[PDB]
Design a binder for this molecule. Structure first.
Ligand code: HEM
Ligand code: HEM
Lengths: 190, 190
C-alpha cells in the first residue's frame, strides 16, 4: 500500500503508553472494548468497499470538505483520492486488529502530521491545500461513527451486540482524533 | 448564575454563522436534529441534579481528571467545583434550548477560553491548574454522550425517539468541542 508506513515511521510519537492509558480512561475504553472492536472488524471486513463508497460519498457531497483533496484549480485530485483511499481502508482494519501499543501510537502521530500542514500532500507528492482545518477533524468523529453504524447490523447480530461494537468504534475514533490534535495544538497546550 | 455571561461576552467569536453552517454539515446536523435536541432538553430538564452527580462522579473518580479542579497543593477546590457545576448545569439546557446563532457562537468562544490557559480560573477567581490539555476536551466527547444516554430514555419515549435525541446530543457535543479548539490550535491551523 503506497505511503503506508505503520510500524516503520521515521519518528517515535511524543506520547507513550502512560499517556495512552490516561486517555483510554477519559474515553471509557476498556478490555471489553478491545474485544468488541475486534468483533466490529470481523463484521466490517468483507463490507469495506461499500464502506469506502459511503465514506467518500459523504466527503464528496460537500464542496468545503472535498476541498481538502482538490488541485489548485478547485477540482478533485483523483490520484490523491485513490491513494489515500487505500490507506483509509487499511486504517479500518488497523483500528480493529492492531494492539494499541507504542507502534500504534507512533502511527497515530504520523496520521495527525499528515492531516496537518507538517506533512500533508507529502506522502503522495501532490499539489493540494496545505492544511485541513482542525475544526473538521473533530467534526468528523460523528460521521465516521454514523457511517459504520449501518454496516455493523448487517451480519446479523442482536441490537445489544451491535450497540457494543458501535460504542467501541465511537470510543476508538475519539481517542485517535484526540491524539491527532498534537501537531495542531500550541506547544504545551496538548 | 455567577460567571455565566451568555449574550453578554466581552468579544465577538472569530467564527461566524457561515462557519457554523459548514461545521453543522460536517457533523450531519440538520433541521431534524433541532427538533430532537429541543426534545432532549425537555426530557433532561427534570434530571439535571442526577446528571451532574453522574458527570462529576466520573470526573471525580479519576485522579488525572479531578486534577483540573485542584488547588496547587493537590486537593480538590470545592468552591471551584460547585461554581462551575452551576454553569455546566445551564449548558445542558443551553444546548437543548438556545438557537445556535451568533450569540451562541460567541458563548462557544468563551467556553473554549475558559478551558484553555487564556481564561481558566478567572471566572471564579480561583487558583488551580493553568490549562486543561486539549487531548481531554476531545476525549470527553465520549463520556458526555454516554452520560446523557440513560437519562434520555427515562421519560418513556420510543427507542427510535431516544436514539434520535442521543444522536442529536452526540452531534451537538461534537460541534461544540470543535469550536472550543480555537484558543488551543496554532494560529491559522483551525
Ligand atoms: C474522524 C476523523 C478522521 C479520520 C478517522 C480520518 C482518516 C484518515 C486516514 C486513515 C487517512 C490515511 C492515513 C495514512 O496516511 O495512513 C487520512 C488521510 C487524509 N484525510 Fe482523513 N480522517 C479524518 C478527518 C479528515 C477530514 C476532516 C478531512 C477533510 C476532508 C480528511 C481528509 C483527508 C485527507 C485530504 C488525507 C490525505 C492527507 C495527506 O496528504 O497525507 N480527513 N484520513
Ligand atoms: C465534551 C467536553 C467538555 C464539555 C462539554 C465541558 C463542559 C463544560 C462547561 C459547560 C463549562 C462551564 C462553561 C461556562 O463557564 O459557562 C466547563 C468548564 C470547565 N470544565 Fe469542562 N467541558 C468539557 C471538557 C472538559 C475536560 C476534559 C475537563 C477536565 C477535567 C473539564 C473541566 C472543566 C473545568 C476545570 C472548567 C472551569 C474552567 C474555568 O476555570 O472557567 N472540562 N466545562
Amino acid at each position: 500500500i503506497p505511503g503506508y508506513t505503520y510500524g516503520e515511521t521515521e519518528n517515535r510519537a511524543p506520547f507513550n503508553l502512560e499517556d495512552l492509558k490516561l486517555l483510554k480512561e477519559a474515553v471509557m475504553f476498556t478490555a471489553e472494548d478491545e474485544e468488541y472492536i475486534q468483533k466490529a472488524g470481523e463484521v466490517l471486513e468483507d463490507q469495506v468497499e461499500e464502506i469506502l463508497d459511503t465514506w467518500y460519498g459523504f466527503v464528496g457531497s460537500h464542496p468545503h470538505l472535498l476541498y481538502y483533496f482538490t488541485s489548485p484549480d478547485g477540482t478533485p485530485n483523483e490520484k490523491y483520492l485513490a491513494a489515500v483511499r487505500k490507506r483509509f481502508s487499511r486504517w479500518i482494519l488497523d483500528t480493529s486488529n492492531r494492539s494499541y501499543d507504542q507502534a500504534w501510537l507512533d502511527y497515530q502521530y504520523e496520521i495527525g502530521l499528515r492531516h496537518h500542514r507538517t506533512k500533508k500532500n507529502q506522502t503522495d507528492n501532490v499539489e493540494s491545500v496545505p492544511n485541513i482545518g482542525y475544526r473538521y477533524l473533530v467534526a468528523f468523529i460523528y460521521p465516521i461513527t454514523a457511517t459504520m453504524k449501518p454496516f455493523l447490523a448487517r451480519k446479523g447480530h442482536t441490537p445489544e451486540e451491535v450497540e457494543k461494537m458501535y460504542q467501541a468504534w465511537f470510543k476508538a475514533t475519539t481517542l485517535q482524533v484526540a491524539l491527532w490534535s498534537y501537531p495542531y495544538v500550541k506547544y504545551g497546550d496538548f
